[PDB]
């Protein structure tokens, strides 16, 4: 589990998102596996706007924040699970690293601030949402 906190928005896995965001959507795109919901209260993340290739990310199944290499956002083939058919997701970056399905929604960072959050993974894999491109979450 886990959320992104900008502005009035508040970022999820699209997977995870509670009933009470459904009720307050902003946007959401399931290609994506990303639900922007709306806040009460304002936020404190800032989101990086960059190409950085390395990071740092939250693993909630360590408990431990990891230093990673990840690639570009790209179009990825995910296998199925309890929440998708097997389908191709976009804006997904995959590092090596270990996560769990309950990693979704852990944090990725580097030097300009939040890249994206745990999305995919397994077999030593792990793979984060994009957030750079929404630049629309910096305002109104
Ligand atoms: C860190 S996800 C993970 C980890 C280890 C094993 C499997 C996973 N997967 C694949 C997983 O449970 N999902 C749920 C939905 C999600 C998606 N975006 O399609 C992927
Ligand atoms: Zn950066």
Not at 24 to 36: A, C, H, K
Not at 59 to 69: A, E, G, L, Q
Request: glycine letters at 10%; hydrophobic letters at 35%; charged letters at 20%.
């Amino acid at each position: 589990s886990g959320a992104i906190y900008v502005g009035n928005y508040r970022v999820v896995n699209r997977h995870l998102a509670t009933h009470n965001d459904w009720a307050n959507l902003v946007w959401e795109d399931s290609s994506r596996d990303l639900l922007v919901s709306s806040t009460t209260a304002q936020g404190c993340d800032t989101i990086a706007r960059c190409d950085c290739q390395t990071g740092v990310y939250y693993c909630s199944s360590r408990r431990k924040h990891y230093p990673v290499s990840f690639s570009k956002p790209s179009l990825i083939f995910v296998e199925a699970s309890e929440y998708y058919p097997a389908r191709y997701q976009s804006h997904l970056m995959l590092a090596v690293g270990h996560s769990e399905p309950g990693d979704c929604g852990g944090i990725l960072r580097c030097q300009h601030g939040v890249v994206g959050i745990v999305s995919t993974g397994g077999n030593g894999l792990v793979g984060f949402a994009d957030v750079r491109d929404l630049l629309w979450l910096d305002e109104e």
